[PDB]
């Protein structure tokens, strides 16, 4: 509350460390469904169904231009990519399995870097 604060956690490296995680997600062999925005002209149903499209290149641009206020808003966009994927793709598909794999990969790096 006013003039009463928990000890200051050092967040000075968070930007660099989120960048590193994102590089590791970008270079994963199962990243291909997520590297670029889904083409809303060429994929019937995507525009109407997926209210907030997100992809790795959009996260990279946001990160590089100071549009994440803190490390949690970064994680929310990464998770959005996988939530969207699960919304639109059957589990038993190459893309469906890719999303599950990448979400696991992300959540481990997140825990090991920050928790």
Swiss-Prot record:
Ranges for domain Bromo come to 9-113
Q: In which tissues is it expressed?
A: Expressed at varying levels in several tissues, whereas a smaller transcript was expressed specifically in testis.
Subcellular location as annotated: Nucleus
Q: Which domain of life is it from?
A: Eukaryota
Q: How is the quaternary structure described?
A: Component of the BRF-1 ISWI chromatin remodeling complex, at least composed of SMARCA1 and BAZ2B, which regulates the spacing of histone octamers on the DNA template to facilitate access to DNA. Within the BRF-1 ISWI chromatin remodeling complex interacts with SMARCA1; the interaction is direct. Component of the BRF-5 ISWI chromatin remodeling complex, at least composed of SMARCA5/SNF2H and BAZ2B, which regulates the spacing of histone octamers on the DNA template to facilitate access to DNA.
Describe the function of this protein. Regulatory subunit of the ATP-dependent BRF-1 and BRF-5 ISWI chromatin remodeling complexes, which form ordered nucleosome arrays on chromatin and facilitate access to DNA during DNA-templated processes such as DNA replication, transcription, and repair. Both complexes regulate the spacing of nucleosomes along the chromatin and have the ability to slide mononucleosomes to the center of a DNA template. The BRF-1 ISWI chromatin remodeling complex has a lower ATP hydrolysis rate than the BRF-5 ISWI chromatin remodeling complex.
Q: Which family does it belong to?
A: Belongs to the WAL family.
Q: Can you say what this protein is called?
A: Bromodomain adjacent to zinc finger domain protein 2B
Q: Which gene encodes it?
A: BAZ2B
- Summarize which stretch of the complete protein this chain spans: 2054 to 2166 of 2168
């Amino acid at each position: 509350s006013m003039s009463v604060k928990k000890p200051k956690r050092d967040d000075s490296k968070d930007l660099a460390l989120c960048s590193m995680i994102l590089t590791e997600m970008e270079t994963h062999e199962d990243a291909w469904p997520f590297l670029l925005p889904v083409n809303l002209k060429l994929v019937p149903g995507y525009k109407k169904v997926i209210k907030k499209p997100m992809d790795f290149s959009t996260i990279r641009e946001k990160l590089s231009s100071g549009q994440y206020p803190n490390l949690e808003t970064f994680a929310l966009d990464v998770r959005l990519v996988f939530d969207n994927c699960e919304t639109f793709n059957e589990d038993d598909s190459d893309i469906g399995r890719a999303g599950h794999n990448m979400r696991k990969y992300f959540e481990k790096k997140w825990t090991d870097t920050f928790k």
